[PDB]
Structures are given as C-alpha cells and as structure tokens.
Design an enzyme around this catalytic site. Structure first.
Site, mmCIF file in Angstrom:
data_model
loop_
_atom_site.group_PDB
_atom_site.id
_atom_site.type_symbol
_atom_site.label_atom_id
_atom_site.label_comp_id
_atom_site.label_asym_id
_atom_site.label_seq_id
_atom_site.Cartn_x
_atom_site.Cartn_y
_atom_site.Cartn_z
ATOM 1 N N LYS A 167 -3.174 4.707 4.052
ATOM 2 C CA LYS A 167 -3.662 3.348 4.247
ATOM 3 C C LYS A 167 -4.607 3.370 5.450
ATOM 4 O O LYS A 167 -4.522 4.275 6.288
ATOM 5 C CB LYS A 167 -2.504 2.382 4.524
ATOM 6 C CG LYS A 167 -1.410 2.366 3.460
ATOM 7 C CD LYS A 167 -1.881 1.769 2.131
ATOM 8 C CE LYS A 167 -0.825 1.960 1.039
ATOM 9 N NZ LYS A 167 -1.278 1.385 -0.256
ATOM 10 N N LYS A 193 -0.952 10.865 -0.961
ATOM 11 C CA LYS A 193 -1.740 10.572 -2.153
ATOM 12 C C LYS A 193 -2.893 9.625 -1.875
ATOM 13 O O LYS A 193 -2.890 8.904 -0.877
ATOM 14 C CB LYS A 193 -0.858 9.948 -3.254
ATOM 15 C CG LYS A 193 -0.259 8.588 -2.896
ATOM 16 C CD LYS A 193 0.743 8.058 -3.933
ATOM 17 C CE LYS A 193 0.096 7.620 -5.238
ATOM 18 N NZ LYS A 193 -0.943 6.609 -5.034
ATOM 19 N N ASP A 195 -4.937 6.341 -2.730
ATOM 20 C CA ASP A 195 -4.489 5.053 -3.219
ATOM 21 C C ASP A 195 -5.091 5.004 -4.636
ATOM 22 O O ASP A 195 -6.115 5.643 -4.894
ATOM 23 C CB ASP A 195 -5.061 3.935 -2.348
ATOM 24 C CG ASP A 195 -4.026 2.893 -1.984
ATOM 25 O OD1 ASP A 195 -3.357 2.395 -2.882
ATOM 26 O OD2 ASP A 195 -3.872 2.566 -0.797
ATOM 27 N N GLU A 196 -4.498 4.224 -5.534
ATOM 28 C CA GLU A 196 -4.981 4.152 -6.912
ATOM 29 C C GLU A 196 -6.435 3.758 -7.064
ATOM 30 O O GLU A 196 -7.104 4.197 -8.001
ATOM 31 C CB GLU A 196 -4.103 3.231 -7.769
ATOM 32 C CG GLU A 196 -4.261 1.722 -7.530
ATOM 33 C CD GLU A 196 -3.543 1.238 -6.298
ATOM 34 O OE1 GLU A 196 -2.390 1.648 -6.095
ATOM 35 O OE2 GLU A 196 -4.125 0.440 -5.534
ATOM 36 N N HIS A 286 -0.297 6.969 -12.129
ATOM 37 C CA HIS A 286 -0.138 5.674 -11.474
ATOM 38 C C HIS A 286 -0.276 4.621 -12.585
ATOM 39 O O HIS A 286 -1.184 4.699 -13.422
ATOM 40 C CB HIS A 286 -1.207 5.485 -10.373
ATOM 41 C CG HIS A 286 -1.015 4.254 -9.538
ATOM 42 N ND1 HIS A 286 -1.389 2.992 -9.957
ATOM 43 C CD2 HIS A 286 -0.485 4.092 -8.303
ATOM 44 C CE1 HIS A 286 -1.091 2.109 -9.023
ATOM 45 N NE2 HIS A 286 -0.545 2.751 -8.008
HETATM 46 O O1 CAP Z 1 -0.911 0.138 -3.391
HETATM 47 C C1 CAP Z 1 0.293 0.162 -3.150
HETATM 48 O O2 CAP Z 1 0.866 -0.892 -2.942
HETATM 49 C C2 CAP Z 1 1.081 1.475 -3.052
HETATM 50 O O3 CAP Z 1 0.317 2.472 -2.477
HETATM 51 C C3 CAP Z 1 2.321 1.328 -2.171
HETATM 52 O O4 CAP Z 1 1.970 1.261 -0.793
HETATM 53 P P1 CAP Z 1 3.059 1.121 0.335
HETATM 54 O O5 CAP Z 1 4.041 2.437 0.245
HETATM 55 O O6 CAP Z 1 2.292 1.158 1.592
HETATM 56 O O7 CAP Z 1 3.891 -0.050 0.030
HETATM 57 C C4 CAP Z 1 1.627 1.927 -4.449
HETATM 58 O O8 CAP Z 1 0.599 2.314 -5.300
HETATM 59 C C5 CAP Z 1 2.464 0.907 -5.277
HETATM 60 O O9 CAP Z 1 3.791 1.219 -5.059
HETATM 61 C C6 CAP Z 1 2.291 0.770 -6.807
HETATM 62 O O10 CAP Z 1 3.259 -0.050 -7.447
HETATM 63 P P2 CAP Z 1 4.312 0.534 -8.536
HETATM 64 O O11 CAP Z 1 4.804 1.737 -7.660
HETATM 65 O O12 CAP Z 1 5.368 -0.469 -8.651
HETATM 66 O O13 CAP Z 1 3.469 0.846 -9.700
HETATM 67 MG MG MG Z 2 -1.410 2.324 -4.112
#
Ligand code: CAP
Ligand code: MG
Ligand code: CAP
Ligand code: CAP
Ligand code: MG
Ligand code: MG
Lengths: 467, 123, 467, 151, 316, 123
Positions: A167, A193, A195-196, A286
């Site tokens: 982040k 990782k 981020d998506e 993801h």
């Molecule tokens: O963008 C986000 O929010 C995250 O990086 C979490 O960040 P934090 O660890 O900083 O919370 C993950 O991709 C989510 O968990 C996706 O949701 P799911 O896993 O439910 O698909």
């Molecule tokens: Mg993410």
C-alpha cells in the site's frame, strides 16, 4: 417418433418441465433461486429457465424435427418453495453433457447464465450451485500445481502461509515498491503482492516494477534463508500484453504471478493457467468484481459457483474471504466453498449452502486466501477457521505497524507461530485466542506494538448473503 | 404453402421487396431525402449490376459495389423535379443501365438513402 | 508539506470526502448508487468507496508519505439522496487519469468495481455511469469499423439491417445448420448467426459449421444479388482457440464473426477486436451474462456502463434490447444508452439515466442490435424506436414461420420495407403501425401467414430496472 | 445543408481565416513566424498556411461537399505583428484532433510542416511552437523510462 | 516496362480535400479520376490512418476502384497507397497489405518518416515488385533559404541512393517555388548516369552513377491545363505530371477533369513530335484542342487567368 | 455538363485520346521516331488486345503486355516509307489484329515510341 410441425407459441412447461426425470451421472445440474413475476406459475418459470439456457426459444420452430430434442433439452426436474421468502423457489435443472464444449468455462456459463436472467417473466434469478459431472471435470487441466505441489516447491509445511498487499494501492514508484517489498519479506512473511489494480500505469510501469521487485525478493531470501515470492500481476488489456508479462516473470526465475480472473476474463485466465503449468509458475488468482455478481441473495451467482469455475479454469490460490475482516463472508457458507476448493469430494450439505455432492476426480486443490482488514488479534480465529492449508494476508496490517514493514511482518509471523504451537499442544484457539496472543507479547516487542494499535478494531455488520 | 422462387429473383436492396414504385411513390421518396437536407446523386451501371469477386476474396472485399456517377451530386438542390428530370435524362442516355438514386449526409459522411430507380429490360 | 506518521485507523471521510473539489476534464467520474448499513453516514460510505477503489486501505500506512496522495486519491465530491428510496444516495467519485492503464478496460473495472461492492459497511452498491474523459478515450482503438464503414463495406443503406439466430439453440448438425442458414438468407435477411452458446460441441464442431455455413451464405448471395453474412462464433475457452477460429473465418473470406464479450472476457475481447481491425472482419458482440450484473436497481452495474466499455474495447454491433420483446428493457433508459453507443456526444440527461455528459472524440459508433422475442407486428415499433442505424433479429420469428425459413425471411423483409416506405412518405409508425402491416398483408402471402400466427403475442411485465 | 459547387479559385482567407474562433482543448495549436511576399496580406498568408497544412488546395473542389469541412479545416485564428521587424507576423493556427494519426510524430509533422514552407507567396516561414493537447499526448508512449526511473 | 507506358509523361492526381474524406468516398473519387485518362491517383502526403479514414479500409476501397477503372479503359492504373507510419512495424504492415492486394505502387514521405525507415521500405519494394513513389514533405524547411540549410539537389541525390522510383521535383510554374535552371540541374542528377559540373545550374561537382537506375521526377502543385506545354517542354517524356485541384476542380467532375488533362497532354505530345515549338505555340496548341474537346474547353475557361509569379528565394 | 461514356471506350495508351490520325499525321509520328535515331518495330495481337491477369496477381504482373513481333526490328531504317509499307503488309495479313508501332532506344534500352496504328473492325 415423428410429429407434424405446428407453428405458434406453447408454454415452456409442455416440453421443459420434467418432474419424473432421473438425472444421469453425466449431466450438469444447476440450482436456481427463482422469483417469478406475479401470475407466472413456478413450473412455467422453471421451464423457461431450462429452455432458454439450452435448446428452446419463444415460439415453435420446425427445425426441432431435424434432431432429437429429448436428448439435448435442459430439464427442470424439481422445484421446492423457499422458506422465509415469498414467491421464491429453488428450481433444479439438468443439462446433458453434449451441450458443453470441453475445457471451456466460458461456454459453460454462456449456456447456463447467458440470457435467462433478463427474462421479463422473472423478477430476479440467482444461480446457487452447479453439479459438475466427473466426465466434464476431466476435460479441464485444473490448477497448474495445487496445494501439495506448491508446498513442495516452496519447502513450506506445518502452518498457514503469510502474504501482504503493498500500500498505498496506487501511487508508488517501482523503486519504492521494491523497497517496501524487501522490508516486508525480510521480517518473516512468505509473500507480498501487487494490488489487484496495479498493472502498468504512468507512476509505475510493469517491467520496472517486476525488475525492482525481483531484486528485493532475492535480497530478502538471502537474508532470511527462507524461500520468498511476490505476486507479479500479469492482468492486462489484451492476451498479448498479459503474455508478455508472464514471460518476463519466467525470465526472472521468480516463483509466482497473479491474475484478476473476472476482470481479465475466463478465456484469458485459462490461457495463462496453461502457460503457468508449462513453465512452472504458481498462479495466484484475485477475485476482483465478484461482489458485483455474488453479494445479493435474490439475484446473481453465488461465489461457490465462481470458485468451482476457477478450480476448473485454473489457479493455485484464490481469495475466499476472511469472515472477520472488512469484507462480507459468513462462516458456514465460507467453510462450504473452502471444502469445495480444497477437497476431492464434498457431500451435499444445505446448512452450508451445498446443493449437490461434488467429486473432483483428483483435480488438484486450491489454496484459499484470507485477506482484507485483518490484524494480529484475528490470528487465532483465522487459524481455527481455515487451518494450515491457507494463505493469510496482511497489507494494512503490516505496513500500518508503527515501527515499519519488517517489524510488522515479525508481529504477524510471531502471532501465527504462537497460534500454531498452542493448537499443536492441544489448546483451544477459539477459547484461549486472546490469551495466546497476550502470552507472545511478553517476549515479542514487535507483536506488543502491533497489539496496542489494533486492540479495539472489529468489523461486525449484518451479512446480506446468508442461509 | 408457397415455395419462394429461385430463378430470376435478384434483388436491389432497400424497397426491392415491395411492389414497383409508381411515379407518385418515387417522388415521395425523393421528397423525403430532400426534406432531410441530404444531397441527391444518381449512379448507373451497365456491365455489372450485382456484386461479384474477381480481384480479391478477403473479408469485406467485393467488386461491383462502385457504379459510375451521373454528373455530380446535386449540392443546393431543393426541387424534387430537378432530380426526376436528371433521372429521365440519365434514362434516355443509358436505357440498358441499372440506375439508382442515393442521398448523402455530409456531417456523418454516409449515404442515408439508396434505391434502384430504373432497371433495363429483362430485369 | 510533510507530516508525522501516526499508526491507527481513521475514518475514510477525513481524506476521501472532498465536497469542495472541482473535477478536472481528465478525471474518470463515477456515479454510485450507495445503500449504507444502518449507522454508517453517507459521507463515510461514499469515502470508503472512493478510498478502496483508488489508494487507501483500512488503517494508516506510512508509505503514503513516500508519494503525493492528493494527486492520486479518488475523491467522493458530491452526494445526493435518492427520491423514492430510503437510506440510498447517489455518490459521485472522481479518479485521476494517472490511476488507469492506457487502453485497458480490464484495468478500469478492476479499480472502480474491484473490491468495494463487498464492503461490510454497505448493504448494496450499484455503478450507474462513468464519465470517460477524452484523453483516456484516445488510448483505445474502439470499434474495428463502426456504423459508416460497415454500411459502406456491405453496400447497405436506408433501412435497419435484418438478422436471425438459428434454432434450436443447440443440437443441430453442421450440415443442417448450413441448410437453415441458406434458406433464411435467400428470403431477404442480411444476416443469420450462431446462437451465443454455439461454440464447438459433440453434435457440431466449429470448423465443420464454419465450412458449411460459408457454402450456404455464398449460395444465398449468388441467388439474391445482395451481400450476406453469418456471424461465426469465435467465443472459446482460451485465447489460442478463439484466435484459431477467427483465422479460419478470415481464410474463408466471410465478412463477420461474433464474440460473447462478458463470458469470454475483456482481455480476450480486446485481442479479437484488434485482430478484426487488422484483417477487415466485422465483429458482432453478444452480451451474454449481462443481466446477471445489470438487472437489479439496488446492486450491480447498469448496462450503459457495460455498453461504454464495449465501445472502448471494440465491437461493431452490440445487443441493446428490444423494449417490446421477451427480455427486459425500458424505452427511455434504452434510448439513453443507444445514443451513448452511436453518437459522438451525449449530454447529461437524468430522465434517461445519463448522469454525465460524454464525448467520444470521433470514436466510431456501434450498431445496436434488437433481438429476442420479436415478430412482424413489432416492426413499426422497432423501426420507430431505433431508426435505420440498427439490426433487428428474428430467430423464432423466422424459423417459426409455417411455410419455412425463406418465407419467414420474406415476411420480415417485407414488413420492414413497408414500414420504411410508410415512414419516408410521412406516415406515423406509432399511430398507423398496425394499419401499415395490414396493408402489406394484402399483396404479401408470406407476411399474411406470419401475421395470423403471432397476432395475439405480447410481452408485458413490470420492469425491474427503471427510472 | 450545403451550397452549390462553383469551379474557380478563391482566396484562402474566405474559408481559413477565422479570427473569432475559440480554440478547443483538443486542438493542436501552432505558432508560425510568417514573412509574406510584398503585396500578400497577412490574413491571406496566414490562411494559406492553415489551408495547405490541413484540407485545402489552390482551387475549389466539389468533393468538399461530401464532408463537413468546418470540423476538419485548419484555422488561422489570430495574427500579431513582430516588433522591430519588417512585414513579419506571428500567425496562430488551430488543427482539429481528428487530423492526426495516434502515436505518430511523423504524421503530425507531415501535416503541419509538409508543404507550406515552399509556397511562392511566402518569403520565409518558421514554426515557433506547438500546443499538443493532452488527448493527443496520451496516444504516445513517451520516454522509455524518464528521469525518475533512470536515477 | 511493367506498366506498358511509353512516349509521353505520366499523369497523376492527388485526391482532395487533403483530409476529411471517408474510405468509400476516397475510392469513389479515385475511380472517377482514373477512368478519365489519368495513369495514377494518390493519397495526400498527410493521409496515413486517422479517425475519419483508417488505412486498411482506404487500401481496400481504392483497390476496388482502380481495378474497375483499369477494366473500363484497358490501360494499367495505379493509386499510390501511403505506407508512411509512426513505426517501422506499422509502415511494413501497410506495405504488406498492398502486396497482398496485388497493386503496383505505394508511396512514402522519406523526410518525415526518415532515411532509416525509407531504406527498409526501399529494400522491401525491390524484393516484392512494388513501385515506390517518394513525397518530399518537409524539404522546404531545410532547402528554401540560400544562406542556410541544404540545397534540394543534395536531398535528391540522397533519395536516389536510399531508394525510390519517383520523387517530387517541383513544377517551376506552380504554386510552390522552383527556378528553371536549378530544377533542370537536379532533374538531370536524378535521371541520368553522368552529369558534369555546371555552376550556372548550381552543379558544383561532376557526378557519375555507375548504372544506378534513374528516378522519375514528379511535377505537382498548383498546375493546370494552360501549363501543359511548359511542363512538357521543361520535363520531357520521363516525368509524372500531377493535377489534384486541376482535376477535382473541373466544373464537370473527375472523369471530365481527367479527360481534359489527358487530352491537353496528348495534344502537346503530338505537336512536339510534329516539330512544333511548345514554348512559342503552347497557347495555340491548347486552343486548337478545345475545338474538338468539350472537356478541355470547360477547363481552360476556368483557369485561363491563373498564374503563380513571385520572386524566388533560392537562386544561383 | 457531359457525362464521360462508360461503354466501348477502351483506350490504347499514347495518342489514343486524340482524333484518329490522318495519313499525314501518322507519317509525321514515324518521322519523329526516325529523326531521333530510334529503331522501328511492328507488333500485332489477335486474341488479347488488352491487359488481363490469368496466371498471377502479384504486384507488377500482368498478362497481355507482350504482343507478337512482325518480322524483326528495322535496324538501319532511315526511310518512313519502309515502315509504312510493312504496316500495310501486316494489315493485309492480319486484318483482324491490333497493330502498333514502337521505337527502341538501344542506349537506354527503353521503348521511346508506342502507339496503335491499326485496330480490327469493332474498335
Ligand atoms: O485491496 C484490498 O483491499 C486488499 O489488498 C486487502 O488489503 P488490506 O490487507 O490492506 O486490507 C485485498 O485485495 C482484498 O482482500 C480483496 O478482497 P477479497 O480478499 O475478499 O477478494
Ligand atoms: Mg488488493
Ligand atoms: O438466445 C436468444 O434468446 C436469442 O437468440 C434470441 O432468439 P429469438 O430471436 O429466437 O428470440 C438472442 O441471443 C437474445 O436476443 C439475446 O438477448 P439480448 O438480445 O437482450 O442480449
Ligand atoms: O498537397 C499538395 O499541395 C499536393 O498534393 C498538390 O496538390 P494540388 O495538385 O491540388 O496542387 C502535392 O503534394 C504538392 O505538390 C507537394 O509539393 P512538391 O511537389 O513541390 O513536393
Ligand atoms: Mg441467442
Ligand atoms: Mg499533397
């Protein structure tokens, strides 16, 4: 048997409602939660769904006579009213094996979920589950590696794996990305990782990030003596771009890449899955966009169906929710699809929303990933719910540590190992969870600092997707 | 039950499935194109009234789509009689040609009207 | 400006709710219909959406200090309560240009629609519209050809085009498929098409179908003297298979192929769109699965957003609904996204659900396709609603004709041309529609036969997606 | 709407000199230092430059009627004299975004600097600057890395 | 030899307006021009691939158009398809489709595209039998002023080495600058095998080409029927005379516009072959032809008083 | 405004858009060829008076460009009468063929003259 062609429209139920049908072990079975418009009987609503998702249309066509419709038609064979809901029914539909293209999740959804959700005669429609027959399962490659092979490649056993999303989501430069990565990895986490949404952008182009991240992960690996990985995102706008990214990762010799299967799509995901199998790359999946489809109980597709589809298309990891984090996920429902992702056989169990018994004929299992709004205090619960075969990710929970990334990782690794040890010694994680954490804070300053910051943080809201 | 014929059933796109246009009906189509401020133009062809593929067979390539322009597009025309007059003039000079009326929309640069106004004997 | 890092969680609104922000002409603007959980203020709900779809997470991270967050953060800049709904608000969010990867619809949705729909703090979430700035629009190729070029290639002007889906959906053999196709095409229709789920299956493999369909369309073209096409479905399980199908179609010299963009995916659709541009192939897009996402008013993504995304990714045609057919589609909303698909500029108009003014900087327009449960009596209405720049498809409405495929096509072609002539002569299609059809039945036996069969067939149900 | 076609030569200023035009943010703007031959009015010389680097030629052609020349034409929207200089001006020309090929500097220069520098009606011509709109800037890759990444 | 054309200058035409026409309207204009007697038509130098007309679509319609004209007239036709692109890859992609279409000629802006890209294309045209027309867009930025830059003759020699089958040479009498003697100097440098030093024509050194093929000079830019005698006299048979506005500006359309130019040219050729002095009898030869050619009469009437006379910047 | 004819308007390259050559005009063209010291030659064709493409469609390939040689090029010819005599000789023997006169420049090895001198009935 032959019959004279008679033009005109007939009710769908005359041909598509077959309550006396016994399903074949080669049929794809579907459980639809159907909410008909007032005046439309459930038998007609169920039949319309079966018809328009297989062989029929709105009026009689003579061409049906050139083939054997009984052999190809989808059949609504069972209906049951839903308790606690009005004018809602669970309709079971059977589709013969012949209707589907081998190895194509894309073709499967095109038929079953293609046009039926927009029918004027229905108020809402939700696909709750699919029984994928073993003969169709064998036409897919499945995960390029799966749980056993992954643990064997990375030489990691006896505990859940640990990850972390870097982040802020967007805005960091390639070099700062590597900097954050090395610091996170050296402190004890197995992976970090992208981020998506981190693909290739003005502030950070993909190749630069891949290069700096490779340097960072190798340095952290050398320092700790434990194998490390960083999910390099290959999600792109075209198949060609996606491929160029996977290729460079291969060239770097790194162990894992990632892909957003829903936004990228099933056709591209299946291509990448095959490449990962051919080149020894682990593939983290993801589920970005899933909640757009799976959150409401009355309309859409339940996540368990999207999960089964990934196991077929291919992915070594897949996010499964946290239950206790910032995103929705009910415990019973979650455990249900977690078994569907890891096991070789799961029996029908309606208390967990499992409508059909599912067999996988040795298709490798997928590692569920718990991520999103979780922190140290959640460790005992996460360890108890998912067990060893899981990946627990702490993004904000690592980079939000007051002493930085390395101490944040240490706090997470220590919190996990303390839970593993306690469980192994016979302690009850659901009962002694807070006590176990407190005991570790006594000798781990890093964990103590983490605990004080997130002590009062909980995420408790009424769930929308329930049973 | 009637069987749709096979022989001598060539068509000419828009309006070709309706009964032959009468003098009054033809004039109304011309009024329409002018009312929309489109530019009228006449085209004629003698040797190849229908599409064929002699020079290439790749996607979207067809021979016979281009016919020859009769004079120039009638920029500024507001009188339907002007168009029909040209039709008669083209007809007398080329009695054995297929002749069509088209209407251009300069803003989108597409023909918004196209229909056969005359066809030689045996068609 | 610098600030001391303070670990801990703060409300999203302290950083992400910016009601005084003036949007830049380079920002991507989004209109979300937000329904918060009880106790969550709309400002916090809107801020959470903006944060988690751009740069933030659940707790404070020190890494924000390495960059300039003000420059990258998504901002909820406006909120308004929805009339006629309780605890629902329209929240406007602005995203800077830098957050997005050029030419990737996949990346765009990954950020805006990625994880926010599953937030525990929200009951439901729906993306109603996106303002795509012209600077981002220019990074996409758009339709490989578009309305003008298509009409020019096919030499067709002055009326809506006519299509037809072959039925039954599945079950016919390759040769029977070609047989049905030739008969349909020779009677006056411009195109025929593979059903969306017709890819490659045991009863009919793709290559055999492509081959027999090519023979059929060339025979019908020679017989009628009018250019014909048959949408050959290139939808497949992998990018590689999809490509092999497009390649063979190119080899056959046919004019058009089709793709199911949602089930196939944006990454694969963009690849195919580029190939179609490079090889002169028209591309018809089927929206299979859209209703799973866009039918409910309280949660999902409106179709207009999925439509804009296709115009960017690429497609020459796209289904747009019929309004009067078997599938849902409200007139005002439909006309709204139809303009968004064809025009170069559409002004904000809330009575049609258009939240932002959209400019396309000469990106080619897309031909809307009306298909599904329509018949001859619907012709005046369809012609009046869509106009000339549309494709009207009659599957059951052609193959359901009592005299067969050729007479069925004739009935449709005649019904259309009668409407075109009447309109051109100044008649009111909405007023004299039935009269116009009746007049044509007097000299067209084929049309008379069609009219009697479908006389009492209407599809009138309350719509779910309204304004 | 359109007018009749009339063969014959017309001054470029009749169509290409538009002093009341307000530039769009998508336009490529060019600033030329124009030195006309004696007897050539600055408006005409500025119009000639705009015309021949966009859509026009020396005589009227009927084909203009097939398009909407107004949305495609180059336009000389402003002229200002050069201080302490004999018969020299700075002519500002606007070019619609649609005239250029995406990602191609070769095409941009072919239009703006292609043939106008050799006009008999001009003694000299210099392109001083170009305002490249952001919508066009986004169609290019730009530096492979850039300062930050290089360091 | 490939085109089977001998005994007269070749005739071309640039389609107008420069930009803004759709692909189908481009092909329509092309067919009408070629059918009237022109050997070639051409994409304008700045016509590459843009929102209003993408390149592949244009190549397609132009091919259909030129084949129609060829079949109608019985004479070989061509349309310079512009291969100029932003990258070498894009340029090659356009050259390849032209080759697939079976057309005879393509064009390239050698200065804006660059010498490196031009040499690549030159070699590809040689390996695939494609004629290569070269446009000198941007040359005046470099060669106009007498005190600074590079004279066109140096740019002309560079092109003959890099490779091209045609190259614009100026018209002398047209809308763009070009002095007679200087022009005659570099036209010799382009076509001949040997040219001796001649300061009166700006030729500083004696140049030998050791059998390097000659390049065809192309006269284009603001010319019309009344210039025909002068152009035929200056350039001779080995040249291409192009009339863009001079064809599409004809009161009766493209086909008659082309006829006018083809008739005016053939009248000058016949007169010359009979021993008539084109310089002195030029106007008379044209007037004579208008007696039997309505197409030419209509053209002459429109451009009778149009001349381009201004002081030249580049001089010896 | 005249529309340029579409039918039976085949042309024959150089000089074909001018009125037919009179006896003296033709002789002057021959004189021109000889004055430039180019070698005269007659070529005739009976089956394919115009270019076509049967054997290949690659760039620059056309069938019908080669015609058949009447005797041999007239090396050392300085008298137009000789060329005109051969032309008549060829006509009487090939009254149904197209006949053209060409002139070779051996130094450049290029045909500097080429025009149709006779056309069979129907043209
Ligand atoms: O963008 C986000 O929010 C995250 O990086 C979490 O960040 P934090 O660890 O900083 O919370 C993950 O991709 C989510 O968990 C996706 O949701 P799911 O896993 O439910 O698909
Ligand atoms: Mg993410
Ligand atoms: O499967 C079908 O139902 C169709 O073939 C219609 O068949 P009929 O013409 O026989 O009704 C079309 O794909 C739908 O129209 C798709 O819906 P939409 O167009 O709304 O995406
Ligand atoms: O863009 C133009 O102006 C032209 O098409 C001529 O058009 P017109 O026939 O309508 O004049 C030619 O490219 C110029 O001749 C270039 O100059 P040069 O030949 O001197 O390089
Ligand atoms: Mg269908
Ligand atoms: Mg030009």
């Amino acid at each position: 048997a032959s019959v004279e062609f008679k033009a005109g429209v007939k009710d769908y139920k005359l041909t598509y409602y077959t309550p006396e049908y016994e399903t074949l072990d080669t049929d794809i079975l579907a459980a639809f939660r159907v909410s008909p418009q007032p005046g439309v009987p459930p038998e007609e609503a169920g039949a319309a769904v079966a018809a328009e998702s297989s062989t029929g249309t709105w009026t009689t066509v003579w061409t049906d006579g050139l083939t054997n419709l009984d052999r190809y038609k989808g059949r609504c064979y069972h209906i049951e009213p839903v308790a606690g809901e009005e004018n809602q029914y669970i309709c079971y539909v059977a589709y013969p094996l012949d209707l589907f293209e081998e190895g194509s999740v894309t073709n499967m959804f095109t038929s079953i979920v293609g046009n039926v959700f927009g029918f004027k005669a229905l108020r809402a429609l939700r696909l709750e589950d699919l029984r994928i027959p073993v003969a169709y399962v064998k036409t897919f490659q499945g995960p390029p590696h799966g749980i056993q092979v992954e643990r064997d490649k990375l030489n990691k056993y006896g505990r859940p794996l640990l990850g972390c999303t870097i982040k802020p989501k967007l805005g960091l430069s390639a070099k700062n990305y590597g900097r954050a990565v090395y610091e996170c990895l050296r402190g004890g986490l197995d992976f970090t990782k992208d981020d998506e949404n981190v693909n290739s952008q003005p502030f950070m182009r993909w190749r630069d990030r891949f290069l700096f991240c490779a340097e960072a992960l190798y340095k952290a690996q050398a320092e700790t003596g434990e194998i490390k990985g960083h999910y390099l995102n290959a999600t792109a706008g075209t198949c060609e771009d996606m491929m160029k990214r996977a290729v460079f990762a291969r060239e770097l010799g790194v162990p894992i890449v990632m892909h957003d299967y829903l936004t990228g799509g099933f056709t591209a995901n299946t291509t990448l899955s095959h490449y990962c199998r051919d080149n020894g790359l682990l593939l983290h999946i993801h589920r970005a966009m899933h909640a757009v489809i799976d959150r409401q109980k009355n309309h859409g597709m339940h996540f368990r169906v999207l999960a089964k589809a990934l196991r077929l298309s291919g992915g070594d990891h897949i996010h499964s929710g946290t239950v206790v984090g910032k995103l929705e996920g009910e415990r019973d429902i979650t455990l249900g699809f977690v078994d569907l992702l890891r096991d070789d056989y799961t029996e029908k169990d309606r208390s967990r929303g499992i409508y059909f018994t599912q067999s996988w004929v040795s298709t490798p299992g997928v590692l569920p990933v718990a991520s999103g709004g979780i922190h140290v205090w959640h460790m005992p619960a996460l360890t108890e719910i998912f067990g060893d075969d899981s990946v627990l990710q702490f993004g904000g929970g690592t980079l939000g540590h007051p002493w930085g990334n390395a101490p944040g990782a240490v706090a997470n690794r220590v919190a996990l190992e303390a839970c593993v040890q306690a469980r192994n010694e016979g302690r009850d994680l659901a009962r002694e969870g807070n006590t176990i954490i407190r005991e570790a804070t006594k000798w781990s300053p890093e964990l103590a600092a983490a605990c004080e910051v997130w002590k009062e943080i909980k995420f408790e809201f009424p769930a929308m997707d329930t049973v | 039950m009637q069987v749709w014929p096979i022989l001598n059933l060539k068509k000419y796109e828009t309006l070709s499935y309706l009964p032959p246009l009468t003098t009054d009906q033809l004039a109304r189509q011309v009024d329409y194109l002018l009312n929309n401020k489109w530019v009228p133009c006449l085209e004629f062809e003698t040797d190849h009234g229908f599409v064929y593929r002699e020079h290439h067979n790749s996607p979207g390539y067809y021979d016979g789509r281009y016919w020859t322009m009769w004079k120039l597009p009638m920029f500024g025309c507001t009188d339907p009689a002007q168009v029909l007059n040209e039709l008669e003039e083209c007809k007398k000079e080329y009695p054995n040609a297929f002749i069509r009326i088209i209407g251009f929309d300069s803003n989108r640069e597409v023909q918004c009207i196209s229909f056969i106004a005359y066809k030689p004997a045996g068609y």
